[PDB]
Amino acid sequence: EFKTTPVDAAFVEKQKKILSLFYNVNEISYEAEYYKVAQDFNIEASKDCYTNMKAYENFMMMYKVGFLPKNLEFSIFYEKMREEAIALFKLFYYAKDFECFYKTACYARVYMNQGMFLYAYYIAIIQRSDTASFVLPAPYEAYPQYFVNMEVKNKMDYVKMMDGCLDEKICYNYGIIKENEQFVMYANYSNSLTYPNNEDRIAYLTEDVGLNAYYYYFHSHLPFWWNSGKYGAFKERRGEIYFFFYQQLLARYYMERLTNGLGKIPEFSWYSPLRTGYLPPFNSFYYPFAQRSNDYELHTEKNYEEIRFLDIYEKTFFQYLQQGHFKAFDKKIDLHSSKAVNFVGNYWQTNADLFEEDFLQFYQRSYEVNARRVLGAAPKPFNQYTFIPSALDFYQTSARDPAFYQLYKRIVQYIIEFKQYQVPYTQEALHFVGLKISDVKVDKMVTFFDHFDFDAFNTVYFSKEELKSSPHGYKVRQPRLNHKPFTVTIDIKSDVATNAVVKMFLGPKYDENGFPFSLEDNWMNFYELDWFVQKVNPGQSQITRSSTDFAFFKEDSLPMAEIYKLLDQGKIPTDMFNSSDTMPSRLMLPKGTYDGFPFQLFVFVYPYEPTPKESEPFKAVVPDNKPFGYPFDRPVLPQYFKQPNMFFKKVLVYHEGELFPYLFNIPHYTPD
Template sequence: MARQTQWQLRQRFLMDLLLQVHKPLLQQELIEMGSRLNENPSDYEADSWPSLIDFMERVHQGRILRPYSIYSQLQEELPQQLLGVYRFLLLAKDWRTFQCNACYARSHFNPVLFVNALQLAISGRPDTKDLVLPAMHEVLPQLYFDKDVILDAQQVNWQQLAPIPNITLKRSWKEILGDIVYPRRFRQPLEVPVLPAEPIVIEVKPLRTLLSSDVELNGYWNSLISRLLITRNEQGTAIIDGDRMMAFRNAHDEYMYRLENGRAAKPEHPQILLHNIKQFVALCELEELTTGHKSLQLIEPTLMTTGGVRYKATKLNGLDVWLLIRQSTEELQSQIDKQLEKAVETPTMETVGQVIATNYWQLFRHLSLAINGNCTMEPNLLGMATSNLRDPIYRTMLFQLAQLIARYERPQVSAYDNQQVQQIHVGNLTTYEHLVDSDLINLMDQQLLQTQRNNLQFLQRRLVARQLRLNHKPFNITYELYASEPMVVLIRSYLIPPGRDQAGLLIESFVSELAMGKNILVRQFPMAKSVHTLRKLYEAKKPLDSSNACSFPQHLLLPRGTAEGLRLQLLVQVLAWNGSETIAECEWAGSVVDSTAPVLTSARVDVVIHHHSLKLKD
C-alpha cells in the first residue's frame, strides 16, 4: 500500500472531524487530541495571545455555545463567540496545535459554530489553504434539506449500504473441527453478498430549481455572513498608531495593526456584501420574469435544526412586517447621510458599504426580535444564514437594501473619448436542468458509522439526496474594442431587462491591457462543475480545485431561460482602471473595489436565453 502524502493525511483529518459533526466524537485518537483546552501562549502566533484572552475567559465561564444548543446568528453574544473560535483555530502556531484546537472545538462547542469558524480559518492558514472542505449541505444536511429528506435518510439501515457476511447458524461437527485443525488461510472465506452499485436515492421534492432553495447558494450565503460577523468584530480592535507614525503601545497593538493592514490588501468585505445583495436581487428579478411568480412569496419553513427542532413560522401579518422594514431602512439611510456629511473625502460607496455592513447584524436582530420575540429555543429563518434566503421577510429586506444602495450609485462618465466598443458577439445562451446527488452519509446511525475508527471504508453504496440543479451550456463573449492609446481598463458585463439603464446581474468583471488600435478579447464560460462530495474528498490523493469563495456558485452565472427564449440585454461598460494589479484574487474584485472608476464608454446588445427542461419519468 502506497504511503499517504502529507496533504492526504491532513485532508483525511479534516474529513474525520466533519464526519457526523453534529454528534460526539467516537474516534479515540481525536478524542485524546481534543481532551484539554490549550492555554499556552507560546503555542500561538507571536504577540497574538491578548486577542485570545476574551475567548479563553468565555470558555471557562461557559459562554461559548455548547453542543445540542440552538444556534442563531442573532444571539447577542454570537458574533464574539464566532470570532473567538475562529481565532482559536486561525492563530494556532503549527499544524499539531491546530489539530488539537480543532478537536477541542469539535468536542466542546456547537457544531454549526464550529463548522462556520473552521470554514473561515482554513482559508486563512498557510498550512491549510490547499485543503478542501466538502459542501456545507453535505456536512450539515439538516440545515439545508427539508425535514422529509432528513427523516427518510435516517431510516436507512446500515445493512443496505454495507455487506454483511452470510453466516450459517447450524454447523456440523466436521466444520467446527476443521476451523480448529486447519490454519486460517486454508479456511473457506465467508460469503459476502454483492450490493447493487447504484446509490440509495432520496428525491428532494418538489423537483424544481428555486433560487431561494438552492443549497449551494445558501451555503455560500452562510459563509458570507459569517465572514461579515467576524470582520465587523475585528474592526473594533483596530488601532491607528502606525498610521500616526507613533510608537506602538505594546506588541499586541503592533500585531493587530499588521493584521488589519494585511486585510486591507484584499477586497473590502463591506463592498463584497453590497455586491452580493445586488446580485441576489438581480437574480430574483430575472427569475420573476421567467416564472411569473413573485420572489417574495412565502416559502414554508419545512426545516429542522441538527437537534430535530422544527423552525418557527412567522405569525406577524404582512402590513406590520412591511412597516417595520420601511422604518429600518429609513433609519439606515439617515445614518448613511450623517456619515457622508462627516467623511467628505471618502468615496460615497465606500461609506455606504461601511454603514450597511456595520449595522447589518443589529438591523436583522432588531427585526427578528420585533417579529419573533426574544425566544432562542425556537429557531426561525431569520436566525440562520443557511435559511435566510428562504424567508420572504429577509428577501424583502434585501430588496429594500438594494434600492437604498442604488440611490447612492452615480456612475461617473469620463470626459475623454479615447475608447470605443465596436462590436460585441455573444454565443448561444442556454440553461438546462440536471440531476445532482449530495452525500447524506452524515445522517447515518452514528454507532455504525463511527466506532473507535471511521467505518466509511466499509460502505459499498452511497446514500444521496437527488435534486435538480440549474446549469448553463458553455458559451463565449467576444469584445471588439478600439483604443486611441495603450491603456489598462476594467470591463464589466451585466444582464438587464430591455430598456433598463441601471446595472443588473453582473456576468463578469475583468481587467485587461489594451494596445493602441483594435483589440479583440474572447472570454469563455464553461458549464459549472459539480461540487466535491464527501466520498470524493475521502478518496482524493492530491489537492483538488475548489470553487471561488468570493462570488455566487458558478451554476447561477445565468438566470433560468425559457423554452421560447428569455429576451434580455447585455450591458457592457469599459471603465478606467487605476489599480496596480491586472489580476485580482476574485474575478470581479475590480467591480467591488473600484466603485468610483469613471465609465469611458458603454454599449448594449440584445441576447436571448433558452432553457431545456429535464424530462423526468414518474
C-alpha cells in the same frame, strides 16, 4: 475537464487532518484520531499554543463556566452564543501553528456544540494565513439538515432504522435506489405548502444548494463581527463590497422573477401586514422552524420594541442625508467623498469597522439582526441557549425565505438614496478615446435542469460499530439549474496599443409590462458576468471569451469522497480553494423559455491602470482602481452611455428539456 491543481505530500497530510473533523459531525467516534488527540490535549496547561494571551485566558474564563451544550441550535445572531463562537475563533486563529490549531479543533469537535464548532472551524480555516489554501467540504455536506427538506431527511432516517430496503420495487417508487452500494434519494423542491403563493414558482432557485452555500461562504470570508484589518487597504472599501454583494444578488433574483412572470420585489412597512408568507420545511432538536403566514402582521405586542429600534435606525440615515455633513461615530461624514461610501455600508451592516474596533461588542445592537428577528416570525427565545429557529437565523437557510430578499431590497434602496449624492460619471471619465466596439456576437444561451448529487450522511446516525470506518453513502439527488457553455465575441476598431479591461453584465431588457427599460431606472438591475485584461493593438481585431472562463463563477464543489480520491493522486480541485465564495456557474443564467427570454448584455471596454498586489477577502475585488460594479455602481446620466466603447446587445435565453424540475423525479418516467 474539472480544474486540477497539483499538490505535494506534506499537504496531503494536513488536508486529511482538516477534512477528518467533518466526518459524522453529529456523533463521537471513541476510536477516531480526533478523540484520542482531544483526550490528550490539556487545555489549562497550554497557554503556549497561543500567540495571544488574552484570547486564551478569555476562553478559559468562559470555559470554566461552560458552553452551549451539544445538540442545541446555534446562531451567531443571539449574543451569548456569539460571544462564545468568537472566543472559539480567537483560539483557533491565534494558534502558533498547525499542530496547535488541530489539537484545539479536535478538542472543540469533541467537547463543544457541533454547530458552534463548525461555524468557528470554517471561518478559522478561511482566515488563518497558513490554512488559506486548504480546501473545505461544501457547506451542504457539513450541515445537510440545512439543505434537505424534511421529506427527504425523513426518508433517509427511515431507510437507516430499517438497515436498508425491504424490497427494491417498493423503494424505487418512493424515490429510493441503491447505486454502488450507496443510497440515493430523489428530492423535489417544495410545493405550495411551504411557499403558499407565487414565490413557489421560484423555489428551484431559492432552495438551490449552491445558492444557499454561496451566502454562507460570503459571510465566512468576512464575518460582520470581525474588523477587516487583516486585509490592508481593502478595509477602506468594506462597505462598498457590502452594497455590491447585495445589489448583484438582488439583480440576479429579479431576473429569475421576470422569467417566471413575477414582477418587482415587494416593498413593506414595519407597521403593516407582510404579504408573502413562508413555512420552512425544517426542524431543530426541539422545535419545528417558525412559520410566517400570508398577511402576517409585523406590528404586534411581541415586536413593538424591536420595531421602534428598526424605525429609528432607518430614519437616522434619512437625517444624515438631509444634513449632508454630520458627526457620526467619531469623524465628520462628508457625503461627497468615498470615505462616505465605506461608512454607508458599515452603517447598514453594523459591522465591527463602523465602531473601528476589533470585534463586535456585547451591547451593540444590529439592524439586520433585529430585522431578521421580526421577519422570522419566531416566538421569543426560551432562554439564552434555546431559541426557536427560523430560516433567517442562519446564512445556510436565509435565501430560502422571500422576506430575505425583501429586507435587503429595502437596505439597497436606502443606499441608493445616498447614492443620489454622488457625482455621476461624465463623458470623459467613460469615453475610451481611440477605441470602438463595432459588434458583439453570442452563441446560443441555453438553460436546462440536470441531476446533482451530494452526500447527506452527516444527517444520518450510525452505531458504535459503523462509526469505526467513517460511514457515509446517503446521497440526495436533485434537479438543479444549469446552462450550456457559450462564447462571447467582441469586435473592435482601435487606434491605440494598450492593456484594457473588458467587463460584461447581464440585465433586463423589458419590464413586466412590455416596455424597454431605461438605463436611469435599470442600472441597479445589472449583474456582472466577467472581468479580464487584454492587450489591444490598432486596427480591427476581436476578443473571444468563453463562459467557462467568466471570472465570477465557479464549478460545482466536489464531494469529500472525490476530494480524498484526488488527494491520493496529489491533486486538488482549483475552484474549491482559489474561489469558494463565488457563485456556482450553473446559476449563471436565469431559467429561459422555449422561445427565448429577452435580456441584454452590456459590454464595456476601458483603459487598464496597473494597480498593486494585494490578497483580499473575495474574488469580487479585482486588481483595479475602479469602484466595485463600475460603471454601474451609481446613478446614470443616459446620454453618456452611447460611448463608442460600450455596447448593449439584445440576447435571448432559451431553455431545453423539461421546463419543470419535478418531471425529473417521477418513478416510471424519463424526461425531455
